[PDB]
Design goal:
Strand order of the largest sheet: 1-3-2-4-5
Distance between the termini: 25 Å
Organism: Escherichia coli (strain K12)
Protein name: Thioredoxin 1
Shape: globular
Function: Participates in various redox reactions through the reversible oxidation of its active center dithiol to a disulfide and catalyzes dithiol-disulfide exchange reactions.
CATH class: Alpha Beta
CATH superfamily: Glutaredoxin
CATH topology: Glutaredoxin
Structural class: alpha/beta
Helix content: 25-40%
Number of domains: 1
GO biological process, one term: cell redox homeostasis
Family: Belongs to the thioredoxin family.
Strand content: 25-35%
CATH architecture: 3-Layer(aba) Sandwich
Number of helices: 3
Number of strands: 5
């Protein structure tokens, strides 16, 4: 399991203070598309070992982190490079699309 399981006390440590690329996934259990991308995040964390880490925050369990990044709509994928939000993607996507997002924004 490569996926970091974030919280609101661990958000600053796990993400804001990381030395590298962190892909936060804001999601919730009732959200179908969130659930649709979850098997995919697994594939990504594997394929992007050593190029980024994948992390996940559940906004109902951890309700005070998401309005800080103006999230209104899930799933939202933020790419952070050293605690700075390099890139935003709202709603769901496929593997190929997610690759593209990452390759294009990792560079």
């Amino acid at each position: 399991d490569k996926i970091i399981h974030l919280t609101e006390d661990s958000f600053d440590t796990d993400v804001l203070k990381a030395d590298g690329a962190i892909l936060v996934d804001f999601w919730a259990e009732w959200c179908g598309p969130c659930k649709m991308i979850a098997p995919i995040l697994d594939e990504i964390a594997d394929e992007y070992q050593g190029k980024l880490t994948v992390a996940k925050l559940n906004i109902d369990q951890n309700p005070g982190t998401a309005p800080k990044y103006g999230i209104r709509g899930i799933p939202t994928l933020l790419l952070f490079k050293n605690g700075e939000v390099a890139a935003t993607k709202v709603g769901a996507l496929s593997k190929g699309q997610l690759k593209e997002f990452l390759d294009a924004n990792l560079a």
